């Protein structure tokens, strides 16, 4: 029901969503200059040496690739996080056009699109009983900008075709996560929420400072997903990025100065 028209939107999730307005949602805009450098804040530890990508899938409102988390394989630990968190998937949030797509903004800048790497306590035991906490999850965003391709992004660009609509999907094994990491692991980080319905509070964002840059070839990949499923009219996917939310009561930290 929920979607990013202009009758299902953002502005409506609050109908079915009550906790849209809540105190801690998310994206928001990043003040670079307002940002508090913390000292006591540990180096991030990504550890996705031995992560286990299995399907890839179109949910109708972006695609998300899936990973093995019945074990540690994939996991991020360090910076702003204490115990152990598994990366469960990864998807991304772009714009119909190459000044708009991301979810966060830096000092209100928006870039093309905005990959979201999600992971959960694993002290919580489930997926599902983690989001139910304040800091079941951990997710790594990611900034795009238009430039150079990006090879380790390829395989993904490859397979859409495949997932065209709704409800589709494709088996995606051996994929590397590692190859859409910037060089710099520096980042700002800040409690918030899911983006998407049901907005849960639950997330503890670490998003980081570099961007990775991507081909315009590639972003264009994406942008022939469709929302609906197959044999109902066709309706691009583009522009499924949620706007800034109010900070609020929240102080957004950095790793670096
Ligand atoms: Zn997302």
């Given at each position: 029901?929920?979607?990013?028209?202009?009758?299902?939107?953002?502005?409506?999730?609050?109908?079915?969503?009550?906790?849209?307005?809540?105190?801690?949602?998310?994206?928001?805009?990043?003040?670079?200059?307002?940002?508090?450098?913390?000292?006591?804040?540990?180096?991030?530890?990504?550890?996705?040496?031995?992560?286990?990508?299995?399907?890839?899938?179109?949910?109708?409102?972006?695609?998300?690739?899936?990973?093995?988390?019945?074990?540690?394989?994939?996991?991020?630990?360090?910076?702003?996080?204490?115990?152990?968190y598994?990366?469960?998937?990864?998807?991304?949030?772009?714009?119909?056009?190459?000044?708009?797509?991301?979810?966060?903004?830096?000092?209100?800048?928006?870039?093309?699109?905005?990959?979201?790497?999600?992971?959960?306590?694993?002290?919580?035991?489930?997926?599902?009983?983690?989001?139910?906490?304040?800091?079941?999850?951990?997710?790594?965003?990611?900034?795009?900008?238009?430039?150079?391709?990006?090879?380790?992004?390829?395989?993904?660009?490859?397979?859409?075709?495949?997932?065209?609509?709704?409800?589709?999907?494709?088996?995606?094994?051996?994929?590397?996560?590692?190859?859409?990491?910037?060089?710099?692991?520096?980042?700002?980080?800040?409690?918030?929420?899911?983006?998407?319905?049901?907005?849960?509070?639950?997330?503890?964002?670490?998003?980081?400072?570099?961007?990775?840059?991507?081909?315009?070839?590639?972003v264009?990949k994406?942008?022939?997903?469709?929302?609906?499923?197959?044999?109902?009219?066709?309706?691009?996917?583009?522009?499924?990025?949620?706007?800034?939310?109010?900070?609020?009561?929240?102080?957004?930290?950095?790793?670096?100065?």
């Amino acid at each position: 029901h929920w979607g990013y028209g202009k009758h299902n939107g953002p502005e409506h999730w609050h109908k079915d969503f009550p906790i849209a307005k809540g105190e801690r949602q998310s994206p928001v805009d990043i003040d670079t200059h307002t940002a508090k450098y913390d000292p006591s804040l540990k180096p991030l530890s990504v550890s996705y040496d031995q992560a286990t990508s299995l399907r890839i899938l179109n949910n109708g409102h972006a695609f998300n690739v899936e990973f093995d988390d019945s074990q540690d394989k994939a996991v991020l630990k360090g910076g702003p996080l204490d115990g152990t968190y598994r990366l469960i998937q990864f998807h991304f949030h772009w714009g119909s056009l190459d000044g708009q797509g991301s979810e966060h903004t830096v000092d209100k800048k928006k870039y093309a699109a905005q990959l979201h790497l999600v992971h959960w306590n694993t002290k919580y035991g489930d997926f599902g009983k983690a989001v139910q906490q304040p800091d079941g999850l951990a997710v790594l965003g990611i900034f795009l900008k238009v430039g150079s391709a990006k090879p380790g992004l390829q395989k993904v660009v490859d397979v859409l075709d495949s997932i065209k609509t709704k409800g589709k999907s494709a088996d995606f094994t051996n994929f590397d996560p590692r190859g859409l990491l910037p060089e710099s692991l520096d980042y700002w980080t800040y409690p918030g929420s899911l983006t998407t319905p049901p907005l849960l509070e639950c997330v503890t964002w670490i998003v980081l400072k570099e961007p990775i840059s991507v081909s315009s070839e590639q972003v264009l990949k994406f942008r022939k997903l469709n929302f609906n499923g197959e044999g109902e009219p066709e309706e691009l996917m583009v522009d499924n990025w949620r706007p800034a939310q109010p900070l609020k009561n929240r102080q957004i930290k950095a790793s670096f100065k």
